[PDB]
C-alpha cells in the first residue's frame, strides 16, 4: 500500500523547525515499520514531495498530523479535499483537534487516532466536526523510544536539584509551575519557552523564582535533564489521566529521577510505585532531600524507571502491529 503523511499546519523540509523535525521522526519510524511512505509538503527535497508533484489519490492511506491561514495550511486542505478515502488524524495535542470554498471543504470520513486513552475527551474536542468521524486510542508518543538509536543517559555529575522543561501555559499549568518550582529553596532550573516576567498573576504569589534558561536543541532533553537529581512531570487539564507525553519518555530515559505530579496520573499508570509521585510543594522538597541524602534510594529509583522504559521498548513489534491495525492495514 502507499502511505502519505501530511502536516496540516506547518511546512516540512528539515530539522531546523520543531514541527518539521517531529514530522520527519514520525515518518522515519513508520517507514521503519516496513511501509512504503512519503511526506507531502510544499516543496520536493530530501524528505518531502510537493503537493503538485503527486496525485492525491495515488495513496491508499492518508495520515495527518498537526502543530492565521498560510501556504502549508491552505495547500494541505485543498489536497485533502480532493482525497477520496478515509483520513487518519493523529490527535497528539488537546488544543489541536481536526478542523476545517468547495476546494477546501473536506468531506472524507475521519478517524481520530488519539494519543490519550480517554476517548470521551477526544470526542468532545471534535464535537464541532460534522464529518463522519471515528475514534481509536494508540500511544503515538512512543515513536521516540522506538527510534533505532534511542539510548538511556549515563551517570552524570549533578549540579542541580530539580529541572523542568516547558513553555508558559497559563491557568492550571501556571498555577502548578508556581506551586512546584517557586519558593522551594532548592536549586531549580526551568528551561524552554518561559520567562520569569510571564509569572505576573496576583492569583499565584511567589517570592523567589527558579533559574530560567533558554530552549535547548530538541534532542538534548534527556542530557539536560541528567544534570539534576530529579526532573518533574507537571499536570495539565485534559492531559491528566489521559495522555502520556514525550516529556515522560525523555525524562524516563535520563539520569534524573522522574517525579510525577500525582494529579497527572492518579492511577499510577506510568510507574506503579508511590515513591515517584508528589502532591504539592512540600512533598517535592521532602522527596528531593531524600534523594539527595540517599544515593541508594536514588540509584534504586533510577534503575526501576529505566527498567520500565526498557520493557516498553521490548514491545516494539506489537506497537508496530497495533499502529498498522489503527490505520486499517
From Swiss-Prot:
Disulfide bonds: none annotated. It comes from the Viruses. GO terms for molecular function: DNA beta-glucosyltransferase activity. Its EC number is 2.4.1.27. It catalyses: Transfers a beta-D-glucosyl residue from UDP-alpha-D-glucose to a hydroxymethylcytosine residue in DNA. InterPro entries: Phage_Bgt (IPR015281). GO terms for biological process: DNA modification; symbiont-mediated evasion of host restriction-modification system; symbiont-mediated suppression of host innate immune response. Keywords: Glycosyltransferase, Host-virus interaction, Inhibition of host innate immune response by virus, Restriction-modification system evasion by virus, Transferase, Viral immunoevasion. Pathway: Genetic information processing; DNA modification. SUPFAM superfamilies: UDP-Glycosyltransferase/glycogen phosphorylase. Monomer. Catalyzes the transfer of glucose from uridine diphosphoglucose to 5-hydroxymethyl cytosine of T4 DNA to yield glucosyl 5-hydroxymethyl cytosine (glc-HMC). This DNA process seems to occur immediately after DNA synthesis since the DNA alpha-glucosyltransferase interacts with the clamp protein gp45. The glc-HMC modification protects the phage genome against its own nucleases and the host restriction endonuclease system. The glc-HMC modification also protects against the host CRISPR-Cas9 defense system. This is DNA beta-glucosyltransferase.
Amino acid at each position: 500500500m502507499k502511505i502519505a503523511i501530511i502536516n496540516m499546519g506547518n511546512n516540512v523540509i528539515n530539522f531546523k523547525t520543531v514541527p518539521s523535525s517531529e514530522t520527519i521522526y514520525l515518518f522515519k519510524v513508520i517507514s521503519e515499520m516496513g511501509l512504503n511512505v512519503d511526506i507531502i509538503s510544499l516543496k520536493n527535497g530530501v524528505y518531502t514531495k510537493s503537493f503538485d508533484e503527486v496525485d492525491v489519490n495515488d495513496y491508499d492511506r492518508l495520515i495527518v498530523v498537526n502543530s492565521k491561514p498560510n501556504l502549508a495550511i491552505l495547500s494541505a486542505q485543498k489536497f485533502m479535499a480532493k482525497y477520496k478515502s478515509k483520513i487518519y488524524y493523529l490527535f497528539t495535542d488537546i488544543r489541536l483537534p481536526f478542523s476545517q470554498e468547495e476546494e477546501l471543504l473536506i468531506k472524507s470520513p475521519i478517524k481520530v487516532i488519539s494519543q490519550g486513552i480517554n476517548l470521551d475527551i477526544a470526542k468532545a474536542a471534535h464535537k464541532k466536526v460534522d464529518n463522519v468521524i471515528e475514534f481509536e486510542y494508540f500511544p503515538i508518543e512512543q515513536y521516540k523510544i522506538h527510534m533505532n538509536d534511542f539510548q538511556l543517559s549515563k551517570p552524570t555529575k549533578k549540579t542541580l536539584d530539580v529541572i523542568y522543561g516547558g513553555s508558559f501555559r497559563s491557568g492550571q499549568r501556571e498555577s502548578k509551575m508556581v506551586e512546584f518550582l517557586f519558593d522551594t529553596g532548592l536549586n531549580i532550573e526551568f528551561f524552554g519557552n518561559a520567562r520569569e516576567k510571564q509569572f505576573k498573576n496576583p492569583k499565584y504569589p511567589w517570592t523567589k523564582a527558579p533559574v530560567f534558561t533558554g530552549k535547548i536543541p530538541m534532542n538534548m532533553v534527556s542530557e539536560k535533564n541528567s544534570q539534576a537529581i530529579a526532573a518533574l512531570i507537571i499536570g495539565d487539564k485534559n492531559y491528566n489521566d489521559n495522555f502520556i507525553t514525550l516529556r515522560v519518555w525523555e525524562t524516563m530515559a535520563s539520569d534524573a529521577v522522574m517525579l510525577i505530579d500525582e494529579e497527572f496520573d492518579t492511577k499510577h499508570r506510568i510507574i506503579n510505585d508511590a515513591r515517584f509521585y508528589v502532591n504539592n510543594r512540600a512533598e517535592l522538597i521532602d522527596r528531593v532531600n531524600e534523594l539527595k541524602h540517599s544515593d541508594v534510594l536514588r540509584k534504586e529509583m533510577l534503575s526501576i524507571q529505566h527498567d520500565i522504559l526498557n520493557k516498553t521498548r521490548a514491545k516494539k513489534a506489537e506497537w508496530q502491529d497495533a499502529f498498522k491495525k489503527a490505520i486499517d492495514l
